[PDB]
């Protein structure tokens, strides 16, 4: 269903054109009504990240070759292997007890070096998000009842795009993005076929070998490679067991991303408000008023955590009217003095028996989610935790 704009949402000038100022959320439509002309629908289709740069790989399962060992007797110098200079080898130097029993003339410590080639069987990719290339697509079709669909393609840097509509004429949309998470503090972690949004610092502090997105050598191999004590001519090297399970566990408290089925590198987001100023030539537009809902509502989906500190609920308005759903978040049931923040812009049930999504930002700690007003109001208690960076 589509929601009509109010009078204050647009402004018609004596000379020039009429500007519409709408805040667009995902999967919520907003319609523009003009007398003797079809209503114009405007909806945010998607917010996506296209081709993020891989900034780091994290190994969680390694494979070694056999152990190459050069060893020298006492008073014969240092034992060197030419593999010590290859960066993809796991090398270690030490001294082993030598003597007559193992082919050395005099007793004492003999130099010894062991190297084993390090390959990464399975790695986790960490992607960098360029916020100047966050895409957002806006659709605009004339109401059906030349009703073709106009799809405009945006990206943070290019925020001004043009279009034309029947009757309304040429249009200019000047839009902005506000992401739901800070991609300056976050990576896109891609382990198997799955993917997540993880914090940057949580990812650098992992005790696993890592490799730059630019390439190079696998650094800090010692998290998966272990060198046993020597026995006079030999050193055992062990690749520590696969660590996918330990990594998949630490990603439990991390929100997920979904690749597009076709593009397969489009990481399309869900949260995010697109603030557009629609610019049109001069024409009178139709407004719409909304009374506040005054009848009993019900939680279709009880308030749930979204992954980025906000709570989503889905209430049903079966009776009242095309109406605005009053939502506040308070410390106590007494004052009804709001302490939270209403993320959702204009929670409006267009028709009766409709189900409306509502996003809210409770204060940290205990609070009460209040939907409605008076005595036929929904009261849901909430708890909010300290928002660690991981684990």
């Amino acid at each position: 269903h589509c929601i009509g704009i109010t009078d204050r949402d647009f402004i018609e000038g004596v000379h020039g054109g009429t500007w519409v100022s709408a805040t667009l959320e995902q999967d919520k439509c907003v319609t523009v009504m003009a007398p003797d002309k079809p209503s114009l629908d405007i909806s945010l289709q998607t917010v996506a990240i296209d081709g993020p740069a891989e900034a780091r790989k994290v190994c969680y399962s390694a494979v070694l070759t056999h152990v190459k060992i050069n060893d020298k007797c006492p008073s014969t110098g240092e034992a060197h292997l030419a593999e010590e200079n290859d960066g993809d080898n796991a090398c270690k130097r030490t001294y082993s007890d030598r003597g007559w029993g193992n082919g050395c003339g005099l007793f004492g410590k003999g130099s010894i070096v062991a190297c084993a080639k390090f390959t990464c069987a399975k790695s986790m990719s960490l992607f960098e998000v360029d916020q100047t290339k966050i895409q957002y697509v806006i659709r605009a079709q004339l109401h059906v009842g030349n009703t073709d669909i106009k799809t405009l393609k945006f990206d943070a840097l290019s925020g001004s795009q043009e279009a034309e509509f029947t009757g309304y004429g040429k249009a200019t949309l000047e839009c902005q993005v506000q992401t739901a998470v800070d991609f300056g503090n976050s990576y896109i972690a891609e382990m198997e076929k799955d993917s997540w949004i993880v914090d940057r610092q949580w990812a650098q502090d992992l005790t696993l070998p890592w490799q730059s997105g630019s390439g190079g050598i696998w650094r800090e191999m010692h998290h998966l490679v272990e060198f046993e004590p020597p026995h006079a001519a030999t050193i055992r090297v062990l690749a520590l067991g696969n660590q996918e399970g330990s990594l998949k566990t630490a990603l439990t408290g991390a929100m997920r991303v979904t690749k597009d089925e076709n593009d397969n590198n489009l990481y399309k987001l869900h949260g995010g408000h697109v603030s557009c100023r629609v610019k049109l030539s001069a024409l009178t537009l139709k407004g719409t008023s909304y009374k506040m809902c005054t009848d009993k509502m019900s939680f279709v989906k009880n308030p749930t955590d979204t992954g980025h500190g906000t709570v989503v609920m889905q209430v049903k308005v079966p009776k009242g009217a095309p109406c605005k759903i009053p939502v506040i978040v308070a410390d106590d049931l007494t004052a009804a003095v709001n302490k939270g923040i209403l993320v959702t812009v204009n929670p409006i049930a267009s028709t009766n028996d409709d189900e409306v999504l509502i996003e809210v930002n409770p204060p940290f700690g205990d609070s009460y989610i209040i939907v409605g007003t008076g005595d036929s109001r929904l009261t849901y208690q909430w708890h909010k935790e300290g928002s660690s960076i991981g684990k």
Partner: antibody
Amino acid sequence: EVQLVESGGGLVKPGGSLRLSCAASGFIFSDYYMMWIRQAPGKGLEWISYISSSGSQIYYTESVKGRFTISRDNGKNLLYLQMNSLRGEDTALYYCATETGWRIDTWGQGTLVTVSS
Amino acid sequence: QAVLTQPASVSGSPGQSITISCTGTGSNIETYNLVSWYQRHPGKAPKLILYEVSERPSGVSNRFSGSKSGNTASLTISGLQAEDEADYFCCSYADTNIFWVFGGGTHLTVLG
């Protein structure tokens, strides 16, 4: 530059003994692993003996584990292969090669070992 | 005959681009990604022309290229010269027990 030279191949009867020698130059012999490789008639190449830089680690294939014995003289830049209990299956072109980086690097011209009863 | 499989005979005219394949099995080439290619003129020593799939030692011409997809490692020679006529071999570090397995060899012919 780097060179390996095989010698000691020839003709011998089954059950007999033969010793292969491989002289190296152009690199530090005591720093690199060396190995013996043979190419049997109608078969692919096959490493049969593998020795470490100091001679402390020895590896053999099952076909030769009891019969062949590989050694090296890092003072004389010589790699040896003592072949005992020679059979018909052991007739092949025999190579000595260096192994650095988990790949066989430099080879020798090879010496021919024929066994006919 | 062998464990790695390469065609017995391949031939090409001078200037042509010729590709020699080396088909391995699973747990023969897919794990370590270190595959070597050798060239042997008759009576001479085999010369390493490719190692680590795509890497080329010093002095090996840019005509020789290396690639791999799944089981099949491939050697490709472009600008085929007369000198390239030799036997080409294929080595792969299979596992920690057998270490290296070789290809049967491939006779390359330059039609003059």
